[PDB]
Design a protein around this ligand. Structure first.
Ligand code: BGC
Length: 287
């Protein structure tokens, strides 16, 4: 059953691996590991370098863990490595950002397309259903690309006078602020900014402030600096993800599969939910 052996290891593998976002994800992973009695391990690529993250995942596969929960920095570039891990007998699920062409057993995380629709439902009314919205996001990551597509589809169906400007945040807060600054310079009709991920939630408001433009801004994630800007009204809100539950249930699924406790293959998708954070509930999200 669920009496674990501490020599059995389960790895969480990330990108942008030092940011606080992963501390909440790993807290859930480790809490489940401790409840079962196995050992949770953490590592990742420190930036968004794709070949870098492939190498990190290879270093993990070489330690022969029982299971790996990985968030893929690119939608397809980790698929062969994931498939290799599974061929070597390691259980693999994806959390937070999927590798949907790989053989991973399950995805656990935000419903990213739906969250982009929810973001558009929030932001479009605030700009009175007209004008251009800058969408600042990590090109190549499945979760960011799906959030963008949900936002874009919602506007196409429900706000015909709204148009989008896509802006790469490049996984780098300095480059992201420069790229949004350039977008604002060239597009006088921008009225709002959707920061699609945590990098953009930091860089976006910074670029907006430096432009001195009065824009509607929806951040992503719950960095204290972002929450403080919701509380002051500098930005209009942010989007909180179920970080802890991504980690907790990734560990439970990995251990279940690795020990053959379920007669069927794992269920394919756990929706860990989003909450729109405004002044009304921002206090709940401080550490
Ligand atoms: O940009 C930093 C982080 O922001 C989050 O919104 C995404 O879910 C993560 O995949 C990403 O690593």
């Amino acid at each position: 059953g669920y009496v674990g052996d501490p020599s059995d290891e389960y790895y969480m593998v990330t990108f942008l691996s030092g940011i606080d976002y992963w501390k909440y994800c790993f807290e859930g992973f480790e809490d489940a590991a401790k409840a079962i009695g196995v050992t949770a391990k953490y590592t990742g690529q420190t930036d968004t370098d794709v070949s870098g993250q492939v190498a990190v995942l290879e270093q993990v596969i070489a330690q022969k863990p029982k299971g790996i929960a990985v968030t893929a920095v690119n939608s397809t570039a980790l698929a062969d490595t994931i498939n290799s891990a599974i061929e070597q007998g390691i259980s693999v699920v994806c959390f937070d950002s999927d590798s949907p062409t790989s053989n991973r057993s399950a995805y656990l995380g935000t419903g990213n397309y739906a969250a982009g629709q929810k973001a558009a439902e929030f932001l479009v009314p605030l700009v009175n259903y007209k004008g251009k919205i800058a969408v600042l996001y990590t090109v190549g990551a499945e979760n960011s690309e799906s959030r963008v597509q949900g936002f874009e589809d919602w506007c196409k169906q429900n706000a015909p006078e709204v148009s989008l400007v896509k802006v790469n945040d490049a996984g780098d807060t300095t480059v992201a602020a420069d790229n949004l600054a350039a977008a604002l310079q060239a597009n006088d009709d921008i009225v709002g900014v959707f920061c699609v991920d945590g990098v953009a939630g930091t860089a976006g408001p910074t670029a907006v402030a430096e432009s001195k433009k009065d824009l509607r801004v929806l951040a992503f994630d719950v960095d204290v600096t972002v929450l403080d800007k919701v509380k002051s009204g500098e930005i209009d809100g942010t989007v909180a993800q179920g970080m802890y539950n991504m980690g907790y249930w990734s560990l439970m699924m990995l251990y279940t599969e690795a020990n053959g406790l379920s007669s069927k293959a794992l269920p394919g998708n756990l929706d860990t939910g989003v909450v729109i954070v405004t002044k009304d509930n921002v206090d709940e999200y401080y550490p």
